[PDB]
Design an enzyme around this catalytic site. Structure first.
Site, PDB file in Angstrom:
ATOM      1  N   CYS A  18       0.834  -1.211   0.000  1.00 57.11           N
ATOM      2  CA  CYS A  18       0.000   0.000   0.000  1.00 57.11           C
ATOM      3  C   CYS A  18       0.855   1.240   0.000  1.00 57.11           C
ATOM      4  O   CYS A  18       2.061   1.195   0.305  1.00 57.11           O
ATOM      5  CB  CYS A  18      -0.959  -0.105   1.199  1.00 57.11           C
ATOM      6  SG  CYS A  18      -0.945   1.342   2.271  1.00 57.11           S
ATOM      7  N   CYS A  24      -0.853   3.815   5.756  1.00 59.85           N
ATOM      8  CA  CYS A  24      -1.698   2.812   6.400  1.00 59.85           C
ATOM      9  C   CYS A  24      -1.683   3.036   7.911  1.00 59.85           C
ATOM     10  O   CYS A  24      -0.709   2.721   8.606  1.00 59.85           O
ATOM     11  CB  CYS A  24      -1.405   1.359   6.016  1.00 59.85           C
ATOM     12  SG  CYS A  24      -2.799   0.628   5.078  1.00 59.85           S
ATOM     13  N   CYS A  31      -3.462  -1.458  -1.757  1.00 61.79           N
ATOM     14  CA  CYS A  31      -4.223  -0.508  -0.963  1.00 61.79           C
ATOM     15  C   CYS A  31      -3.960   0.932  -1.345  1.00 61.79           C
ATOM     16  O   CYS A  31      -2.860   1.488  -1.217  1.00 61.79           O
ATOM     17  CB  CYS A  31      -3.993  -0.746   0.548  1.00 61.79           C
ATOM     18  SG  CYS A  31      -4.309   0.780   1.442  1.00 61.79           S
ATOM     19  N   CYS A  60      -6.392   2.953   2.651  1.00 61.23           N
ATOM     20  CA  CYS A  60      -5.937   2.345   3.918  1.00 61.23           C
ATOM     21  C   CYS A  60      -7.036   1.459   4.448  1.00 61.23           C
ATOM     22  O   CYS A  60      -7.591   1.430   5.547  1.00 61.23           O
ATOM     23  CB  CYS A  60      -5.275   3.460   4.741  1.00 61.23           C
ATOM     24  SG  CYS A  60      -3.706   3.890   3.841  1.00 61.23           S
TER      25      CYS A  60
END
Ligand code: ZN
EC number: 2.1.1.n11
Length: 92
Positions: free
Chosen positions: A38, A42, A69, A72
């Protein structure tokens, strides 16, 4: 002139520890303990920098075949249903 290339993996992942994009506004991070790749922010209880893998774009971490991602994307053993933040519940 001033600086050759980028500084250190520490400035990179420090960009993670913080929040908003500090160095690489678009760089991506892959922690193989939660099975998520991600962008830097996050917030939900995120694994460490101990099993984590960094890139300039998510097209790589996808070319890896990991979990994209850009929202998040949360998930704690059914977040809505269950909970129990601590382990001090017996009376009241
Ligand atoms: Zn995220």
């Amino acid at each position: 002139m001033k600086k050759a290339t980028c500084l250190t993996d520490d400035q990179r992942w420090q960009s993670v520890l913080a929040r908003d994009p500090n160095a690489d506004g678009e760089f991506v991070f892959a922690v193989r303990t939660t099975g998520i790749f991600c962008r830097p922010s996050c917030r939900a209880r995120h694994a460490l920098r101990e099993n984590v893998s960094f890139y300039a774009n998510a097209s790589e971490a996808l070319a890896a075949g990991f979990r994209p991602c850009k929202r998040c994307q949360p998930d704690k053993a059914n977040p809505r249903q269950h909970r129990l933040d601590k382990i001090t519940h017996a009376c009241r």
